[PDB]
Amino acid sequence: TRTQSLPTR
Amino acid sequence: RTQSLPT
Amino acid sequence: DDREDLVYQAKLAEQAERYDEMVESMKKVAGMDVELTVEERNLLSVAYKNVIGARRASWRIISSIEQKEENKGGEDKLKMIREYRQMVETELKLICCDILDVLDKHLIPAANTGESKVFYYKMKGDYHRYLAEFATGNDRKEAAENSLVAYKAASDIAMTELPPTHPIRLGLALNFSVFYYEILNSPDRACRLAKAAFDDAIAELDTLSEESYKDSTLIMQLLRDNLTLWTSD
Amino acid sequence: GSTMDDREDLVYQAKLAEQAERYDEMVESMKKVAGMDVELTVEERNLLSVAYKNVIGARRASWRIISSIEQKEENKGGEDKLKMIREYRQMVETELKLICCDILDVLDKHLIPAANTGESKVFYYKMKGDYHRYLAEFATGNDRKEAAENSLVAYKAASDIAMTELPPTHPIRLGLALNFSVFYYEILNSPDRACRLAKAAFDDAIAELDTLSEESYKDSTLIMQLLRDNLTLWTS
Secondary structure (H helix, E strand, O other): OOOOOOOOO | OOOOOOO | OOHHHHHHHHHHHHHHHHHHHHHHHHHHHHHHOOOOOOHHHHHHHHHHHHHHHHHHHHHHHHHHHHHHHHOOOOOOHHHHHHHHHHHHHHHHHHHHHHHHHHHHHHHHOOOOHHHHHHHHHHHHHHHHHHHHOOOOOOHHHHHHHHHHHHHHHHEEEEEEOOOOOOOOHHHHHHHEEEEEEHHHOOOOHHHHHHHHHHHHHHHHHHHHHHHHHHHHHHHHHHHHHHHHHHHHH | HHHHHHHHHHHHHHHHHHHHOHHHHHHHHHHHHHHHOOOOHHHHHHHHHHHHHHHHHHHHHHHHHHHHHHHHHHHHOOHHHHHHHHHHHHHHHHHHHHHHHHHHHHHHHHHHHHHHOOOHHHHHHHHHHOOOOOOHOOOHHHHHHHHHHHHHHHHHHHHHHHHHHHHOOOHHHHHHHHHHHHHHOOOOOOHHHHHHHHHHHHOOOOOOOOOOOOHHHHHHHHHHHHHHHHHHHHHH
């Protein structure tokens, strides 16, 4: 898997 | 819905 | 080399999903007045299908919003919505005329094989059909007629150059049947073509290659799916 | 003819552009709203954030794919292919700079000077941190050190406002902790600080989750799950 930032719409 | 040839 | 570099650029743009640039590269290739390889043909169609598809999706959404607002009665909202649709429709005409021009001025005159001729005439059929999706009045009749002539030409070459199980022939039948139903409003003819294509393929299903089986069977079931849906109506 | 008519018309266009998924136009619209030097509504700042995120994200994805291809070719040794690849990467990087600077100027000249609530200040300083972080993603040498500093300072400003003005369960606060921890991990390459940030944010929110409403409960728990996901991955 990979790191995650805040998602957007 | 109707569907045509995909890409 | 220019050609080899051009094709490598298109493969990068496809990887990056930057389809405007992929169109730019493959268009230079088609202008070379040479028989394209299967790979280059795929690159070309993918580039244009993606550029046009984004607009086709935007147009359908905006058209949907316009209907809802027309029911509601928002006059000011409708003026902006319509202006937006007209802008997207302008983009659509420009993309279509570009590829249609390339097909008539370079690809078809240089086409060297039966499958490639079928391929290019099917593209002509597709992109005139895309014009007809949003045209109105005379522009609509011309686009529909032009689409029909291209599709019939492809079919006539295919019925003599490709086995009925060939994926390009099948994909031609699929898009042509969609045209009959969606543009000409002929469910009868649409189903007759789809079923005809399905039956001719099934009769020679032993002719399918292991590699063509995946593509062909997926296409033939799209024909079956269309058939089921159209008969539902 | 008034600015308020213009504003509603601009916001309606952005909502159309968003539906049609034409984010270049949605950016153009939301940027015009931001130029009026007013406090944006929650809706307007969301539209603006979505518009810029989609525009930059397409390039960020293109850049990652091209860099991947660049690595593969460097291993193979194809210099001529690499000349084309690097030209492509550089073109995408130029788009990235233009986009990042565009919103960063909007933030510095219009949004932040007019922000009057805690939510919106945290929101704008977090964006500033985000877009300086995107610059740092592909920068090199000094430009990279500078982008990293700008990102760090902006995130620290956002955090200083957030810890005194937003509850620890607040989604903007949690989302700030998420992106700030990612910054520690991906830009500063400090996994320890990234974890300690994620864990602290997660723990403070779980303690007061009972006060959370409903719509904010959904958004908060979802961000807490991203914090937990990143933690499990980094600790793996």
